[PDB]
Amino acid sequence: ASPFRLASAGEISEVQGILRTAGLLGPEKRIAYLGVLDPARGAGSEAEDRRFRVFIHDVSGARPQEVTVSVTNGTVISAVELDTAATGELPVLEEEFEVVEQLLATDERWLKALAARNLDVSKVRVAPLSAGVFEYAEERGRRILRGLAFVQDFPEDSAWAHPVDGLVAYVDVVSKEVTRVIDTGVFPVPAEHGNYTDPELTGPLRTTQKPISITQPEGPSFTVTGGNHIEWEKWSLDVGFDVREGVVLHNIAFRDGDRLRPIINRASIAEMVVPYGDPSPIRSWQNYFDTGEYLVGQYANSLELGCDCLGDITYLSPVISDAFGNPREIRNGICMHEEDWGILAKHSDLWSGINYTRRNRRMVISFFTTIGNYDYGFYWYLYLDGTIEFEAKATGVVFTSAFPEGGSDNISQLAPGLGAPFHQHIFSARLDMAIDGFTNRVEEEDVVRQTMGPGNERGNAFSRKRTVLTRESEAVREADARTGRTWIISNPESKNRLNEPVGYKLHAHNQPTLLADPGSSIARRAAFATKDLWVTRYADDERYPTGDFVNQHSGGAGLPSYIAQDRDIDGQDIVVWHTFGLTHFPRVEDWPIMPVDTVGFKLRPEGFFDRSPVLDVPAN
Amino acid sequence: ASPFRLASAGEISEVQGILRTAGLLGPEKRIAYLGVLDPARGAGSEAEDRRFRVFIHDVSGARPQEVTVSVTNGTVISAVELDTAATGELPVLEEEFEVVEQLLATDERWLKALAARNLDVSKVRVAPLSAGVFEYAEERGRRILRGLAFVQDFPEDSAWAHPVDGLVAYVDVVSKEVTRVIDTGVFPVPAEHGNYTDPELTGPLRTTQKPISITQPEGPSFTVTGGNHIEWEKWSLDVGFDVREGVVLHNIAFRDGDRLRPIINRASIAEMVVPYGDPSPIRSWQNYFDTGEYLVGQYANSLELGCDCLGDITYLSPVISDAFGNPREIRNGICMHEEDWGILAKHSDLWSGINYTRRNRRMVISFFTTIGNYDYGFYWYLYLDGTIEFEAKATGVVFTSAFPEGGSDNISQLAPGLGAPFHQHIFSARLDMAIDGFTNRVEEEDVVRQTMGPGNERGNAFSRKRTVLTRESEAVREADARTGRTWIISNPESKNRLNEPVGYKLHAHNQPTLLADPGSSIARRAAFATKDLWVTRYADDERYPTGDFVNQHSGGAGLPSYIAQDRDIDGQDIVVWHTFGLTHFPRVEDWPIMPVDTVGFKLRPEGFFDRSPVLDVPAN
Numbered sequence A, B: 001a002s003p004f005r006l007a008s009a010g011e012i013s014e015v016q017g018i019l020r021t022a023g024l025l026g027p028e029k030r031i032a033y034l035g036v037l038d039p040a041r042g043a044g045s046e047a048e049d050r051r052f053r054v055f056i057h058d059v060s061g062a063r064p065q066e067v068t069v070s071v072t073n074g075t076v077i078s079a080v081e082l083d084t085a086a087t088g089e090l091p092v093l094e095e096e097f098e099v100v101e102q103l104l105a106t107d108e109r110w111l112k113a114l115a116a117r118n119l120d121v122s123k124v125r126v127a128p129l130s131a132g133v134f135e136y137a138e139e140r141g142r143r144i145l146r147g148l149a150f151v152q153d154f155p156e157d158s159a160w161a162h163p164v165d166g167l168v169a170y171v172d173v174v175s176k177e178v179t180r181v182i183d184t185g186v187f188p189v190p191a192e193h194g195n196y197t198d199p200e201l202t203g204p205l206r207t208t209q210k211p212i213s214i215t216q217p218e219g220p221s222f223t224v225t226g227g228n229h230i231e232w233e234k235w236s237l238d239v240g241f242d243v244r245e246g247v248v249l250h251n252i253a254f255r256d257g258d259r260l261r262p263i264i265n266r267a268s269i270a271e272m273v274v275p276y277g278d279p280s281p282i283r284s285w286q287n288y289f290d291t292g293e294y295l296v297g298q299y300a301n302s303l304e305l306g307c308d309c310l311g312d313i314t315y316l317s318p319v320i321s322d323a324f325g326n327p328r329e330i331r332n333g334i335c336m337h338e339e340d341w342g343i344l345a346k347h348s349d350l351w352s353g354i355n356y357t358r359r360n361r362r363m364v365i366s367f368f369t370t371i372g373n374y375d376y377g378f379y380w381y382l383y384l385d386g387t388i389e390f391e392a393k394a395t396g397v398v399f400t401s402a403f404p405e406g407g408s409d410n411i412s413q414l415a416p417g418l419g420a421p422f423h424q425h426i427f428s429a430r431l432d433m434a435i436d437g438f439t440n441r442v443e444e445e446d447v448v449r450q451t452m453g454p455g456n457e458r459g460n461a462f463s464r465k466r467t468v469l470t471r472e473s474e475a476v477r478e479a480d481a482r483t484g485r486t487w488i489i490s491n492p493e494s495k496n497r498l499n500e501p502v503g504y505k506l507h508a509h510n511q512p513t514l515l516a517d518p519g520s521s522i523a524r525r526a527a528f529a530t531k532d533l534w535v536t537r538y539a540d541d542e543r544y545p546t547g548d549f550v551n552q553h554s555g556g557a558g559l560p561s562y563i564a565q566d567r568d569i570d571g572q573d574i575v576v577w578h579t580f581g582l583t584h585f586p587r588v589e590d591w592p593i594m595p596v597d598t599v600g601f602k603l604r605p606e607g608f609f610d611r612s613p614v615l616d617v618p619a620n
């Protein structure tokens, strides 16, 4: 009955039938995106209307369409034709990936390049990558993928160990034309294999690891109702899944005595960009928008019990649409479990004689996605003490190149002749805030140093200052780790028992933001990534920091255009957008498969409660 | 047989007997510090000599002594009389704590102050705190403690809820004289209790938490030999314990194929300072050097199975000396166990068809200490992939004051009339490095942004730069989070298979350093805390960043004086000193007992291995 329930296979089948009967899903059409729309603000009328947003591609060259459908009423609400040279191309289709390798295999220029290098075309894998927007005028309004080549010596070989540098091709995947083949010179193909299951590389496996058994004899402490509604240790939330964003958290709230207190209305990772820092023309165009261009949810892994998720695991299996509108289940795509998290609070008091220890735990909601060579885990954590944390886990195989003789300022050497270009992995968290309700404001908090003098005669004092962000034009903020800068989201109309506004504090990791020149194509298309924090006024259509159609969009969409409205954000319905990321200079230890590295952020209560919220935790 | 073995009760009894027979341990003497000395450099002659360093206090006013004893040979090696006005006072003795409250109870000025506030002297607890060095000329060369008062309504009451503000006393604990009683005015004593086990405050305890059972059916994967030698998943180390520093890690090494490769010779937390930022004269002198003044090891907790340490736990019970030289066991003072740590590496490859997942684990070595109101956990972690991490966990009860009517720039309000002064918790990690041996160097690594132009026509390139620190005068470094600054410790004489020097990278949390005015007493006495990173040339006598005798030392001892030697550190035996800490603006949620907050650092391999060191981890 909940409007936030996961899409069902029956809903997706009805969307398919509605589109087909309306004449919108002929044999030349493909669904590039399908997802449920959230309830609009003011859904307190119970008049549920389950609506789906659909992007429809046409493989014959006709204009694509954006369509909204009401499953409840069985009708098409709107259908608009898209001019993609203006507003951007649709996301990349899984079926277009294989088109690239097949088309290049019959192109005389590609074959000539492979022949010069003595490579068998049957052994050459092509990584099909998004194109971006650069100097090529013929690409405007066409769907282009660019291809980089890797050699697979045998069917189980890791092709990533054998990059074919000096060679790139561009392909129009609708007209099935190879537009350009660029060959800048022959590099030796690195010869060492990278097969991390080969006993010749691993050596004998360790026999020293003894089992760690994690069980819950009475079952888990959380409950799941309505398919996706979670209650756990005073937390309440709904777990959504969207094919673009992946796991989305709705209606995060905390039961404080008799009141269910809202904290976050919607939390998601709304974009993620992987820009490469190698100036070689073979790779200087290379930027992945994993969320906006590829859709991270559709590549979610099925997670294996005991390997991917350890303990007493509860799975969700979300349903998405395939390119023809058939429902497809991602079996065991979302893991949920609780974890012991060490000591929560401890004190041994000499005067009272009381010794007190309590243990902490966290609730984990996670999924994993695989896009080509990289694998990313997305982890949301809820803690007993009111802390909310997100963590991204990056692993997989690093993207490779030749290592030039004489070295490089922009590429690490991993093995003889084998390089790995420098790059970043940058995320945007979209936090539709609802601290005790929707009237919220953001303050920037800096530590303040004080000079020795009158009123500070011993020179020990220090303080802090808070600056309210009042309008969108002043709400684009940078980190300052040296001044301990944090941001507080508070509700000026809701006070704790000390008559102070209730709030939550955002703690960033203060990692570098986008490093590219501000005049670059990627800085224009990923402007969100150039600043640590943005605050906007909520609006239904302002969903992604990069806009709706990221693929081959010329730039400026999303956050820079939203904030030009300069709206009031002082005690209003607001959205916080936090940029955070990893700057990756690959190390030898990252090869041939990379150990996990992590980045994230957290929010902690700041006078939200009237005292510690975990006094009622039992001794265990 | 190992020279790094823990001190035994028999060794400490022999030290006592050697001191007593030499005439150094009469009835007026107290042992303020006793610890084993590490082997000097070049102990490859097997000629073991177990030596102990002892600080001896005299309760009659005679000069204290520093004494070195050889248990092996049963002799006093040296005994030097100390001039404490010059080189500092000895650490505070546990038995001096109770002297303060008892002496004030019979002082007419103290009694007059308590009478004006209608407080029963029998209910007034006095926190005995270290004195520092300020404007009081009569304190030079005397052992002073300062006392702040709290009301205990009944024997099990938390006195911290009832600070008596406006009142402080100074006490000479040797002559048993109250030197000064300062009363700046009557503040109301906050009346709400802070008893976190009182059902009236906790409410009914939760019944919702189901058990999490963590067991190891075949026992743990590590072995313990010689009392304190650990082998675990290719790691090898010795776990030491010192009454001043607490847990010390020796001889950290990694078994890479057939070679035992050293990484860190000695790792410890060599100082920790808690400076308060309230300019009130009642508290503006307040700075704890928990390690150097109080000795954190002697207040280590006995850790309870299932509450403090969960899982298959192996305990060490270190032995220390009491003030008379009797051995005292800290039962179950050190926990050791391994923990599952999520996904180690994962990739699902489309081209090869191979799906691969491996799990991570870490080895945990931890202890907890309690000094007055604060409790601190010290955690060392070793990971499968070669990462070494330290984490400090801060909990306990915050130090309180009155909350002034009309507010404060330097104090948080926690409850009606109850304040908590701003403060920091700053740690110094001393890392005696031995990356593949003792010829090491430190490089500072910054991200380098590049401008769009020739050779970077698309403006996407970025790079990094490394600066070698060649002499001590240039090796005092500051964090720069915005440029991704890290430090690499490498061995220029040991190369990986790519002919690059092997190294480890230090990743800091980039939290603010000491905030006090640089002209303050605390900035002079805790100069280490004003900078993020120091590198010195190893020397036997350069043990602590604050010097040997921190209590009431006028300033400048330790790191600022060491680095004035300006020694060569480019490919030499070096020591890295890393400052890191928490800046604490107390929140309502910290009251009446504080949930854990954490800070730390980590070191990750950087071309130390020839490829990932965890390829031989089995599928589990």
Ligand SMILES: [Cu+2]
Pocket (backbone or CB within 6 Å): A394, A398, A423, A424, A425, A584
């Ligand atoms: Cu990477």
Ligand SMILES: [Cu+2]
Pocket (backbone or CB within 6 Å): B394, B398, B423, B424, B425, B584
């Ligand atoms: Cu604190």
Ligand code: NA
Pocket (backbone or CB within 6 Å): A085, A086, A087, A088, A553, A554, A555
């Ligand atoms: Na355009």
Ligand code: NA
Pocket (backbone or CB within 6 Å): A265, A432, A433, A434, A438, A538, A572, A573, A574, A575
């Ligand atoms: Na909002």
Ligand code: NA
Pocket (backbone or CB within 6 Å): B085, B086, B087, B088, B553, B554, B555
């Ligand atoms: Na002095």
Ligand code: NA
Pocket (backbone or CB within 6 Å): B265, B432, B433, B434, B438, B538, B572, B573, B574, B575
């Ligand atoms: Na060293």
